[PDB]
Amino acid sequence: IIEPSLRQLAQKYNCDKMICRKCYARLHPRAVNCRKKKCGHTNNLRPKKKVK
Amino acid sequence: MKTILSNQTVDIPENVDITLKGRTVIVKGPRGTLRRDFNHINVELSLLGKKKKRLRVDKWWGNRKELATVRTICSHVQNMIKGVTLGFRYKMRSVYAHFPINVVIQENGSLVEIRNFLGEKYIRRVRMRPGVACSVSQAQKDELILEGNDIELVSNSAALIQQATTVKNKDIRKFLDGIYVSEKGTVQQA
Amino acid sequence: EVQVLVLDGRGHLLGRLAAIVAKQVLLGRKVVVVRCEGINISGNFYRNKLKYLAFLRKRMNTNPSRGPYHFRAPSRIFWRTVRGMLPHKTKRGQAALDRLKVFDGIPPPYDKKKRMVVPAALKVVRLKPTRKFAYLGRLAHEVGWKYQAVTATLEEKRKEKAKIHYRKKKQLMRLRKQAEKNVEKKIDKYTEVLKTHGLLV
Amino acid sequence: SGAKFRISLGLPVGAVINCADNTGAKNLYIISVKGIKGRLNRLPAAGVGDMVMATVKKGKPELRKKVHPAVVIRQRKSYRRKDGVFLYFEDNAGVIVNNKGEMKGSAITGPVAKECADLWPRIASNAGSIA
Amino acid sequence: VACIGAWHPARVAFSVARAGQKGYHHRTEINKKIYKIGQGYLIKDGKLI
RNA sequence: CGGUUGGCCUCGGAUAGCCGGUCCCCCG
RNA sequence: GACGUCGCUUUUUGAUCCUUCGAUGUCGGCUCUUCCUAUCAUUGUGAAGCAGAAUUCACCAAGCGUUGGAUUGUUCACCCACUAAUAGGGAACGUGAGCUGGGUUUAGACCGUCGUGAGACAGGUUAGUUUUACCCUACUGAUGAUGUGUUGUUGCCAUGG
RNA sequence: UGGGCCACUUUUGGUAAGCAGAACUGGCGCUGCGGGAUGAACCGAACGCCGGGUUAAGGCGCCCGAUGCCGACGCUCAUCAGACCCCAGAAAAGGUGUUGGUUGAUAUAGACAGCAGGACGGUGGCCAUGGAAGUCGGAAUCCGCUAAGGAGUGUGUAACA
Ligand SMILES: COC(=O)c1c(OC)cc2cc3c(c(O)c2c1C)C(=O)[C@]1(OC)C(=O)C=C(OC)[C@@H](O)[C@]1(O)C3=O
Ligand SMILES: [Mg+2]
Ligand SMILES: [Mg+2]
Ligand SMILES: [Mg+2]
Ligand SMILES: [Mg+2]
Ligand SMILES: [Mg+2]
Ligand SMILES: [Mg+2]
Ligand SMILES: [Mg+2]
Ligand SMILES: [Mg+2]
Ligand SMILES: [Mg+2]
Ligand SMILES: [Mg+2]
Ligand SMILES: [Mg+2]
Ligand SMILES: [Mg+2]
Ligand SMILES: [Mg+2]
Ligand SMILES: [Mg+2]
Ligand SMILES: [Mg+2]
Ligand SMILES: [Mg+2]
Ligand SMILES: [Mg+2]
Ligand SMILES: [Mg+2]
Ligand SMILES: [Mg+2]
Ligand SMILES: [Mg+2]
Ligand SMILES: [Mg+2]
Ligand SMILES: [Mg+2]
Ligand SMILES: [Mg+2]
Ligand SMILES: [Mg+2]
Ligand SMILES: [Mg+2]
Ligand SMILES: [Mg+2]
Ligand SMILES: [Mg+2]
Ligand SMILES: [Mg+2]
Ligand SMILES: [Mg+2]
Ligand SMILES: [Mg+2]
Ligand SMILES: [Mg+2]
Ligand SMILES: [Mg+2]
Ligand SMILES: [Mg+2]
Ligand SMILES: [Zn+2]
């Protein structure tokens, strides 16, 4: 019964992201390279899966 | 490759008065005053006008990594100017599925206490940064209004509160409860 | 030169100051280095802290009481760097190591003296200004030095007393300028002698 | 509510105590104690109120060659009881239970320690006396 | 103690068990609750304890 | 047992900035 | 992660024969300390085909813990059971002037196979002396030494844990 | 004396080896000295006992003789930097970290990025009704009555969404 506007707010902060395939870092949805020095700033990313 | 000169300029309105004590900016508009020390960056700052009041920042033989700092300094000064003219307000909404999040504002808008986050008995208390005032909105139901002059202090307080209400050992694609920044506006809107 | 050479450690780079001090103290020249908590190290604070913690890890695992002694005060850290640059297993190097003396802050045989500066070890001269550096006092305090607050308050006291003495000296200099303007008519004969030979622009 | 205080154990693994209910067992041979993380060379041991894994050495044949959970109800070893008094029993005795504490039998012969009677309400119901 | 260290740190370490002095040791124990503070043997009259 | 062959009795510091001196406000 | 391909490690077994045959005590267990991390658990996290519960994959991380038994000389193994978990290794394949001596591996003896035989067997079996520290160091404790004239009391904390 | 060993290049067996075996020259053995921190063999140079001068290889912050030159031009920041023959430690693969370069492309008939309007249609022709009067594994593909528009790469779909 959670309002869709607040639901898309919480999804903007928790669900709409990219994950780095090499390290698993949570990156902003327009990312091309990962920010972490651990993975060497790789461009091997995937979106974050959705419960939908 | 070192560019000979990289520079850009900030316009200053009439009601603000700024002073430069070296690499130290004091901004003096109507909603108070602000002050920022930029002595970790090698630039030169200059006031130009006598009735138009431009502010130039100059870089003078920098490479790329230090040519970024020119636009960064100018954006910081523009945020200071906006903070003393209009002042920053962050509206953040509380989002819950089952347990209503009860927020109480202790002394003079400087402390926030979240009680029933996810039905837990632990009461989390976040101290606001000095010069940031939090309040409960009257226009909408479950919404904090936190205002100030420093964008860094206001946004860091909002992020503090937001990372305070965080969900652990659960699905954060479900369990979407928290308090999230809905919009970053100003006061007086002009 | 038979007097003691008193250096101010604030603003200096550790190993460069240590190399200068080591060659001086081998050549003779009793050297005091005060304010070793103000010594800088190039490279960022974290990697300097990690270098010190790796040094702390180095330990004789049969008898750590016999093992390498990790001194924590910034004065003793500087002293151990100069020790590393000296030939300290010989009588000559031991005599030089005794000829050197180091302090945190400025103790009061030396707070009322003129401190010198080594520009070949200064941070503003030897580092690019867009580079990270660390503070020996902060590094020492986070690897286990106990006395950075008491040193700070004593240095604040010393700075207040130095401000008072400096204001006295400025009033004396103003009086001396006033006295020249008063009796210039009887030293005009002597003033032109000095101007002729390059003193007194 | 309330958790049991520590008592003196004195009933190690290889112990043979006597079965104190009407199940048809006579002996209980302890092989384990429920809740022992243990230590090098230290034998796991039990006291009154402890659930143990036990075999029955003599008794009924449909009980004999198995492992059952059991609860120790009487120990010959003296234990302080925190009102000062040290208490001990004449024998060592335990009853066969299931995993959730229900007795396999229906009636307990002899006294049952209070340190297990408050822990196991189904055991204390079948007891005759709480010593 | 049947074995004091391996072959090759080539020394007995400071952390193996050895014989020597037991007791007469300086210790500092904390959280000792005071139950009662006495009053001594005062004399008002034929006295009272 | 030997060395030694005038002294410096002191601001804090900044380094894309400093130092000195005066006319009008404030500090018992 | 198939077809391919690049590595690391020296806890496997080889390959080699540099050191040692005027001798470095040769398996395993027991005992005891320390180290490593290629993390089983626990702390803090990120991911999921993560609803919860359970689990799986990663990261910082070796602080702390990682057990009681049956059988076998066993290392390995397998099972019973408890557990937060029952992780993996190194230190002259740690550790015999620390033990033990079950195995192996002298001399006694039996069996099987082989040999005409004396005898052999990396096949089975049984019985078979485990010596010395008082030296130096290390370590554990115990007196003391070195300057402050002597001596005492009360104290500080460098450094090590 | 008839045990040799090592190095450039050539070379046999071997996954390889400080492995085994050859050819050629030099060395070490039989050889000290300067340098390579340390080292039989590397680099320089071979030695009676000394003074002066100068060098080789190698160096010149300090240990430690010598840059205490107002040395030149750049590159590089590492929360495992890097640092000199033999030589004493790393690869495939990556990086929107920064620096240089090669080639191609677009742009005042106004680029790129952002503020935005019509930004769509019979024809879904065909395909397929378990799928299209938008967005579908298949072969497909036209004209739109258009300042420019599909048999869409956009609106998670049988859907007029
Ligand atoms: C293989 O396990 C051994 O290492 C070992 C051993 O392990 C305890 C004990 C001994 C004992 C002995 C011998 C050993 O060789 C021996 C060996 C090799 C002998 O040779 C001996 O002289 C000493 C001798 O010459 C005459 C006899 O038999 C002819 C022996 O009994 C003897 O007397 C003796 O005592
Ligand atoms: Mg901006
Ligand atoms: Mg879960
Ligand atoms: Mg045992
Ligand atoms: Mg060999
Ligand atoms: Mg050979
Ligand atoms: Mg031998
Ligand atoms: Mg020998
Ligand atoms: Mg021997
Ligand atoms: Mg030996
Ligand atoms: Mg790790
Ligand atoms: Mg510990
Ligand atoms: Mg061994
Ligand atoms: Mg031994
Ligand atoms: Mg022995
Ligand atoms: Mg035997
Ligand atoms: Mg023999
Ligand atoms: Mg015999
Ligand atoms: Mg025999
Ligand atoms: Mg025969
Ligand atoms: Mg035998
Ligand atoms: Mg016998
Ligand atoms: Mg004796
Ligand atoms: Mg300490
Ligand atoms: Mg020969
Ligand atoms: Mg060869
Ligand atoms: Mg020879
Ligand atoms: Mg010759
Ligand atoms: Mg030679
Ligand atoms: Mg040499
Ligand atoms: Mg070398
Ligand atoms: Mg000569
Ligand atoms: Mg050198
Ligand atoms: Mg020199
Ligand atoms: Zn990554």
Side-chain angles (χ1 to χ4, degrees), chain B residues 166 168-175:
Chain B
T166 307
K168 284 177 189 303
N169 304 315
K170 292 289 168 312
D171 208 81
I172 57 147
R173 317 171 301 177
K174 282 193 91 76
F175 299 101

Side-chain angles (χ1 to χ4, degrees), chain D residues 19-35:
Chain D
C19 200
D21 52 350
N22 61 341
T23 175
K26 322 304 305 168
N27 276 343
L28 289 181
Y29 172 81
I30 301 178
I31 73 184
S32 287
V33 175
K34 274 279 176 205

Side-chain angles (χ1 to χ4, degrees), chain C residues 78-200:
Chain C
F78 182 75
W79 177 92
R80 203 204 153 91
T81 56
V82 185
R83 211 267 299 265
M85 287 170 201
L86 279 171
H88 71 111
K89 297 274 187 78
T90 56
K91 306 300 291 188
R92 179 175 76 117
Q94 271 148 20
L97 193 59
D98 276 310
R99 213 167 299 133
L100 161 73
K101 277 195 313 179
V102 298
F103 298 104
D104 289 304
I106 318 188
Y110 304 107
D111 60 345
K112 299 199 189 318
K113 293 187 182 298
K114 186 76 72 189
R115 279 92 65 183
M116 310 271 283
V117 155
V118 192
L122 280 182
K123 189 255 299 175
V124 69
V125 178
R126 304 297 310 208
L127 291 184
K128 289 178 174 63
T130 174
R131 294 269 187 237
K132 297 295 227 285
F133 61 95
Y135 284 101
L136 202 56
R138 184 199 172 175
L139 186 135
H141 160 83
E142 302 198 358
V143 303
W145 181 41
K146 311 276 207 48
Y147 307 114
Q148 88 163 358
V150 304
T151 315
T153 62
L154 287 183
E155 279 296 302
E156 270 286 353
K157 292 214 315 172
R158 198 200 44 86
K159 282 166 198 158
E160 293 309 317
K161 293 190 192 310
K163 267 286 184 161
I164 288 184
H165 155 264
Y166 180 61
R167 291 197 281 99
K168 302 308 169 51
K169 211 173 153 183
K170 271 163 70 176
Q171 302 175 161
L172 264 173
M173 196 58 182
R174 276 196 315 273
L175 271 196
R176 159 156 208 176
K177 287 311 176 190
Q178 179 50 243
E180 297 182 341
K181 286 173 263 311
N182 282 135
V183 292
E184 92 280 17
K185 287 278 177 283
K186 42 185 60 193
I187 69 169
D188 196 353
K189 67 165 312 301
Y190 305 102
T191 308
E192 199 89 17
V193 176
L194 269 75
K195 290 166 166 186
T196 305
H197 297 84
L199 291 87
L200 301 192

Side-chain angles (χ1 to χ4, degrees), chain E:
Chain E
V1 163
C3 165
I4 53 163
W7 186 321
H8 219 103
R11 277 171 313 289
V12 192
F14 83 111
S15 64
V16 315
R18 316 291 267 154
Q21 162 82 20
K22 175 180 196 171
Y24 206 64
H25 290 324
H26 185 274
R27 296 304 189 242
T28 304
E29 285 212 41
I30 59 164
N31 287 359
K32 287 305 189 302
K33 195 142 179 41
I34 283 174
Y35 275 179
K36 185 203 172 38
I37 292 195
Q39 261 290 0
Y41 280 24
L42 301 98
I43 300 181
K44 312 197 191 226
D45 286 320
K47 53 99 177 174
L48 55 99
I49 64 190

Side-chain angles (χ1 to χ4, degrees), chain B residues 142-189:
Chain B
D142 46 356
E143 176 171 357
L144 289 174
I145 300 315
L146 72 163
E147 306 166 339
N149 297 4
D150 194 339
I151 172 162
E152 282 257 1
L153 294 186
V154 170
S155 66
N156 180 267
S157 296
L160 267 172
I161 290 181
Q162 178 160 348
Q163 279 183 347
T165 66
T166 307
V167 178
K168 284 177 189 303
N169 304 315
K170 292 289 168 312
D171 208 81
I172 57 147
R173 317 171 301 177
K174 282 193 91 76
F175 299 101
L176 295 172
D177 308 338
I179 293 159
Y180 306 93
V181 183
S182 296
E183 70 259 11
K184 319 190 182 79
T186 55
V187 186
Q188 297 111 30
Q189 281 77 30

Side-chain angles (χ1 to χ4, degrees), chain B residues 27-70:
Chain B
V27 186
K28 256 295 304 185
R31 297 185 78 259
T33 182
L34 283 183
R35 149 195 300 266
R36 187 145 180 173
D37 215 45
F38 291 107
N39 58 357
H40 50 104
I41 315 185
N42 294 265
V43 287
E44 67 164 0
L45 324 180
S46 45
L47 295 164
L48 301 187
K50 65 178 71 75
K51 64 154 291 303
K52 50 204 176 166
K53 304 308 290 180
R54 279 183 325 275
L55 166 69
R56 271 177 61 246
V57 319
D58 308 321
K59 194 45 207 79
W60 287 130
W61 298 114
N63 49 63
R64 180 185 183 87
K65 208 63 90 162
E66 40 196 3
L67 259 50
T69 55
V70 165

Side-chain angles (χ1 to χ4, degrees), chain C residues 17-28:
Chain C
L17 189 64
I20 297 303
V21 162
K23 177 54 74 77
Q24 286 304 296
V25 85
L26 269 169
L27 291 164

